[PDB]
Design a binder for this molecule. Structure first.
Ligand SMILES: Nc1ncnc2c1ncn2[C@@H]1O[C@H](CSCC[C@H](N)C(=O)O)[C@@H](O)[C@H]1O
Ligand SMILES: Nc1ncnc2c1ncn2[C@@H]1O[C@H](CSCC[C@H](N)C(=O)O)[C@@H](O)[C@H]1O
Ligand SMILES: [Mg+2]
Ligand SMILES: [Mg+2]
Lengths: 250, 250
C-alpha cells in the first residue's frame, strides 16, 4: 500500500466509524442499537455518531468513480445532493487532496434541515412515505455550520469545498458549476431525485458517473426510470450493494 | 501534503479521536466530562472511547522519533511499555506501514490488566500512589484480545506487531527482541519505569530514542534519575509537553 492508498482506506474507515463502532438509532428495520459490522459495511444502519451512513461498499464505489474520472480525464466537479453530516463529501474532498487535484470542486448540496414537509404538490409515493416524520428519529437535520465543522476536523475545509444550502428545487437550476464528473444523488424521494436529474444531470460530462444511493426505495426508482425513459438513456444500471446503483454516462 | 503526510496526520487525529471528540472520564484534575480541545492536544484527559490518552504533542514526538530513526538508519524495533487501548502502538505500526518498512517490528507490552496491586516489595512512592485504585475509573484494564481487535480496525494487525503480555518484571528480561530504535515508557510508577530501563534500555541502539511519558510523576522521575546516574547517562532530557520528556542515546 502506497501513502495515498493508506490515507483513503483510513479515511473511509473513519467517516463510516469502523474505528470506534458507534451504535445505530433504532428505526425502520433496525430494532436493536448494537453496532453490527455487516450493517455498517453495506450502509444499512443509522449511525448515532458516524459522519456518513452510506457504508463501506458505497464509499468504495465513490472512490472508484472519482478515481476513474481523474484517470480517464473526464472533466468536471463532484456534486452530492443530500449530505447529512457530510462524510461522503469529506471523503470526496480527501480523494482530490490525495492526488493533489487543485482544479476540481466538491459541491455539498442539502437543505441542512432534513426532509421537507409534504404538501399536495408532492408525488403520491413521497406523500405516502412522508420521510419528514423520521427527521428526529435518525438525527437527520444537520446544519451547514455543523457540516463545515466536520470538514475542518479532517483538515479538509478549504476553497475546493463549496456549499449549496436549500431545497434542491431552489438550488439546482442555477447552481454555479459548469460541468460534473460525478453526480451522487442521495435524497431518497421521487421529488429530490427528479429535481437533481432534471437540473444537474445535463451538466454531467460524457464518461461521468451518476450514483443513485436510494434505488431500493420505490419512489426513487420511479423517478430514475421516468427520467431515463424521457431522455432515452439506456446506460447500464450497475448494483453497488443492496441499496445503491450507478451508471456511467455514454 | 503527500499521501504519507495525509495518512499519518489522519492517523494521529483518529487514534486520539479529534474526529468524533469523545467525552473524558471525570478523574484527577478533570472535573467535567466535556471534550476540551486543549486537553486532548496535550494528552491531559482520560478518553472514554479514544484509543490513546497521550495526546497530539506526544503523538508528534513519537512520529519524530520513529522517522528520525528511519532516516538516520538507527537499527531496531519499536517497543512501548504500557499501551492501554493500543493507540500509540497502532500509530507506530502505521508509520512503518507508510514508509513500507518490512524489517522492523512494533512490540506491544502490557499486563493487559491495568496497574498491579501494591505489595510490600514495592517502592514507597508507588505504595503511596497506589495507582491500582484508579483502574476501573479510567477504564484502564484492556485485554490483549481487545487491543488486537483495535489494531485490526485500522488494518494494521499483522506479523510486524508482536505482543508481550504480563508484568514488565516478568516479560522484559527475556523478551525476544534484539535491538530497539525507540523505547517508549508509559507505566507511570517507579517500578514500571525501573523494570523497563533495567531490562530493555541496554538493547536501545546508539542514536535511538528513550521516551518517558510520565516524567511529571515524582516516582517515575526518581527511577529515571537513579538509572541515569548509575549508568553515567548525560544525554539531554527534552521536554515534550506538561508530562512527557525524551532523550536520544549517544
Ligand atoms: N428536497 C430536498 N432538498 C435538499 N435536501 C434534501 C431534500 N430532501 C432530503 N434532503 C436531504 O437529503 C439528505 C438525505 S440523507 C444523506 C446521507 C449522506 N449522503 C451520507 O453520506 O450519509 C438529508 O441530509 C436531507 O436533509
Ligand atoms: N508493571 C506493569 N507491567 C505491565 N503493565 C503495566 C505495569 N504498570 C502499568 N501497566 C500498564 O501501563 C499502562 C499505563 S497507561 C498507557 C497509555 C498508553 N500508552 C496510551 O497510548 O494511551 C496500562 O495499560 C497498564 O495496564
Ligand atoms: Mg441514502
Ligand atoms: Mg502515561
Amino acid at each position: 500500500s502506497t501513502g495515498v492508498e493508506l490515507y483513503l482506506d483510513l479515511l473511509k474507515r473513519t467517516v463510516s466509524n469502523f474505528i470506534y463502532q458507534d451504535a445505530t438509532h433504532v428505526a425502520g428495520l433496525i430494532t436493536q442499537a448494537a453496532f453490527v459490522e455487516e450493517a455498517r459495511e453495506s450502509g444499512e444502519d443509522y449511525p448515532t455518531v458516524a459522519h456518513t451512513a452510506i457504508g463501506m461498499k458505497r464509499l468504495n464505489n465513490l472512490q472508484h468513480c472519482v478515481e476513474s474520472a481523474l484517470r480517464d480525464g473526464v472533466p468536471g466537479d463532484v456534486l452530492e445532493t443530500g449530505v447529512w453530516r457530510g462524510g461522503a463529501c469529506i471523503f470526496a474532498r480527501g480523494i482530490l487532496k490525495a492526488y493533489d487535484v487543485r482544479d476540481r470542486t466538491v459541491w455539498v448540496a442539502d437543505s441542512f434541515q432534513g426532509f421537507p414537509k409534504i404538501t399536495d404538490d408532492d408525488h403520491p409515493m413521497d406523500a405516502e412515505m412522508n420521510l419528514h416524520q423520521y427527521n428526529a428519529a435518525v438525527d437527520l437535520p444537520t446544519s451547514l455550520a455543523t457540516v463545515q465543522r466536520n470538514f475542518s476536523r479532517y483538515g479538509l475545509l478549504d476553497d475546493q469545498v463549496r456549499f449549496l444550502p436549500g431545497w434542491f428545487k431552489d438550488t439546482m437550476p442555477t447552481a454555479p458549476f459548469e460541468r460534473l464528473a460525478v453526480l451522487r444523488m442521495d435524497g431518497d424521494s421521487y421529488g429530490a431525485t427528479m429535481d437533481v436529474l432534471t437540473h444537474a444531470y445535463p451538466r454531467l460530462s460524457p464518461g461521468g458517473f451518476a450514483i443513485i444511493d436510494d434505488y431500493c426505495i420505490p419512489a426513487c426508482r420511479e423517478a430514475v426510470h421516468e427520467y431515463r425513459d424521457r431522455h432515452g438513456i439506456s446506460d447500464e444500471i450497475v448494483e453497488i450493494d443492496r441499496q445503491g446503483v450507478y451508471w456511467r454516462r455514454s
